Structures are given as C-alpha cells and as structure tokens.
Design a binder for this molecule. Structure first.
Ligand SMILES: Nc1c(C(=O)O)ncn1[C@@H]1O[C@H](COP(=O)(O)O)[C@@H](O)[C@H]1O
Ligand SMILES: Nc1c(C(=O)O)ncn1[C@@H]1O[C@H](COP(=O)(O)O)[C@@H](O)[C@H]1O
Lengths: 212, 212
C-alpha cells in the first residue's frame, strides 16, 4: 500500500520510501526500516474500538420478547452489545423515564429500539424525552399491522422517532448509526454489502443453468 | 301525583290521604294539611345537585383549541363545569401526570377528555394512570383520520379508554356518566331525547306536505 500520515506524500511510511532512493546506502536502509517500524507500532490499533456502542430494546410486554431476541441476536452480528428491558409508556410512564435516564447517564452512546404492539406510545414518549436516537420496531402481524403502524409514523412536531419494521433491519439501522463513529461496525456493514452481492451473483450463476 | 315515602302506601303524602277519609273531620283535615306541608318542606330540594361533576379536556397542542371549545360549550348545555388544559404525553409526560393528580386529588368526580391528533398517546397514558374515566375525542379530519383513529382504539390490556369522535358527543357521553349520580344532568339528557324526537315529528310533518 501507500500510507501518507496527514495525507502528506513527503511523510510516506510505506515501501515507496525504498523504491524512491536514487542510491541504496546503509543510511537509506535505516530510514526505510524506521518507516516499516512506524507502521508496525500502529497497525495493532486498527483492531481497537475508538467508541462504545449500545442498543437498548424497550418492550411494553414480555409477549413481544421473541421479536426483541431477534433484534438482540442481529446486534451481536455487528459486535454491538444489546440490552432488553420491560417498560410500558401507558401503565408505567414514570418507570419508562427512570430507565431511559439510567442509559442516558452513564456516558455510553445509545440507540433505543421501542417495541410496542397496537398503539405504540413507547417510541413517541421515548423520542420526546431523549436526545439519543429512537427507532420504533413494532411487532406488526397481518391481522392489524396496516392499522397499528400509523401510531409509529404520524407523530406530533418535535419528534425525530424513525420506523423500521424488520427486527434484523432495526439492528442494521442501529449499526449504520454507530458505523459513523466506529470503524469496526462500519467494516462489518461494508463487508456485508459485498457478501450479499456475492450471494446474488452465486444464486444467479446457479439458476442460469436451468436456462440451458 | 301519588308520593310514597320508602315506596310505602300507608305513608302516602299526596291528596289520596284526603280522597280516602271515610268522613272529613277537622282532625282528618289537620293530618291532610301535615302531608301537604311534608311535601312542601322537601320539594325545593329537587332543585339541589346531590353530586359535583367536572369534565377536564386535556389537549396536546393549542392548534386543537377550537375542537376543545366545542366540548366545553356542549358541557355547559348539561350544566357541567369544563376545564381546558394543555399537556403533551410525548413532550411533557411528567407534567401530564402532575395535572392529572391535581384533578384526582381535590375530591370532585371527574371525566377526562383526551384531545390529541395524529398518534394519540395522551388518552392511553391518562387511561393507564387514573381510576376515573377517560374518553379520547381525537380531532380527526378526512386527510389522515382513517389512519389516526386506530391509535385511540387498539390499546394494550388494562386500559379502559373509550373513543367518541363527535366533540358534542364526548360531552354528551360525559353527561350520561354523571347522570348516573346526578338527577339534574340525567333530566337534561331525558328532556333532550324528547325534544329531538319532537323535532323529527315536526320535520316529518313539514316534508309530508310536499307529498300532496
Ligand atoms: N403499545 C404498547 C404500550 C405502550 O405504548 O405503553 N404498552 C404495551 N403496548 C403493546 O400492546 C400489546 C399488548 O400488550 P399487553 O396487553 O400485555 O400490555 C403489546 O404488543 C405491547 O408491546
Ligand atoms: N398526539 C399528540 C400528543 C401526544 O400524544 O402526546 N401531543 C400532541 N399530539 C397531537 O399531534 C398534533 C400535532 O401537534 P403539535 O405538533 O403542535 O404538538 C395535534 O393535533 C396534537 O394534539
């Protein structure tokens, strides 16, 4: 590769320092060795997380737990710790705000996922009372889903609350948010674009055989 | 009329006491006079309210004020005092519960009307946190009303919250609740059934002329 500290070519740390010597002297080889050592002293830091990430899934009822386990598992695929909590905006709004505050208060950057079926008040109340992002991921079913979703979507002014229906999608959206400030999350999202694209190529190659 | 204290005929207080005398003696006429006096000493109490009544209309935004004025005016027709307040379940849930508590705490029987457009969280949070009745009267319009109403209707278990779309209707429903314990409210509802029925008779009598 070519590696420029501060994007400055004259600070090149790669083998180009050796390619560019008019004449190889043992003084020239010592500079090239220092450049290699400089890269070697820093490369292990690419494996280090520069930012903490956390998703908190808030569920209005334990009957939605299975939907919440899918989000949590999906967060694991992106290396993002994910906590489940039970709170109802309608039956325990005092407790919703207390739980919110525990996660707001410990310094760890957090995305909230609100999982509430029927009339989702949980995402709205959370969205209105935190500066952190909130994603509604309602556990919609074809029975009443067409009716229930509008409670997540049409909110009063001053509410940033987003909606992602896929539970794996809600984790992926939360990963995309953390990927702006965490290169390890970003890299899993980028590789995942590649791998999915490769899977399509491989599936099209297979099905293309039935056309001969 | 015939008036029986405790539904006991032998305690009759009306003119039947006079009709029933075998012979009118001046001792008989004094009993009849006491009966008339007994009714006369109590009749003014039929004009007295036996129970206090109050509606509190809670609105998430001052843009819904006109809808709230219609409920208040309609409460006046039933002789029920009606208060307007501004609170948002989503932007100020701490304040929603504090306001609720001021009305729960002063001993006056209260019906809450929650007026919230879009995703109504106000009726649900109120319904979940008071033993008093809550009525959602969302200011629906034909733009998004078909979508918005389901946020009032499909609630988690443990929520008694009702829905009445008409703003005059929400006051009438609140009157019907107070009419179970207040004879003056009941009487206005009963007379109103009669008067509306008479109006139909009169309108049918008019239109019946165009058929000759
Ligand atoms: N929409 C809400 C809220 C709320 O908004 O506070 N609390 C529970 N729910 C949802 O209603 C369904 C019935 O749950 P329960 O009747 O057991 O409370 C669930 O899917 C829940 O998430
Ligand atoms: N549904 C709610 C809530 C809530 O549920 O807390 N707060 C306001 N609203 C409603 O949203 C519309 C936009 O109001 P704003 O954007 O001015 O808050 C109004 O009709 C209001 O009653």
């Amino acid at each position: 590769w070519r590696l420029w500290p501060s994007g400055d070519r004259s600070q090149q740390k790669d083998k180009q320092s050796y390619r560019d010597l008019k004449e190889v002297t043992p003084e020239g080889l010592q500079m090239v060795k220092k450049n290699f050592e400089w890269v070697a002293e820093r490369v292990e830091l690419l494996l280090k997380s520069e930012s903490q990430c956390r998703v908190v899934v808030l569920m209005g009822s334990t009957s939605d737990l299975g939907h919440c386990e899918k989000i949590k598992k999906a967060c694991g695929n992106f290396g993002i710790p994910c906590e489940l909590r039970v709170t109802s905006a309608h039956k325990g709004p005092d407790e919703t705000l207390r739980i919110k505050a525990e996660y707001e208060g410990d310094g760890i950057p957090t995305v909230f996922v609100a999982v509430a079926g029927r009339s989702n008040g949980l995402g709205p109340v959370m969205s209105g009372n935190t500066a952190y992002p909130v994603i509604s991921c309602p556990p919609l079913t074809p029975d009443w889903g067409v009716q229930d979703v509008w409670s997540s979507l049409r909110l009063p002014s001053g509410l940033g609350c987003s909606t992602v229906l896929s539970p794996e999608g809600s984790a992926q959206f939360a990963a995309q948010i953390f990927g702006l400030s965490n290169h390890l999350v970003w890299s899993k999202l980028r590789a995942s674009i590649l791998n999915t694209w490769i899977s399509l190529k491989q599936a099209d190659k297979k099905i293309r055989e039935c056309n001969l």
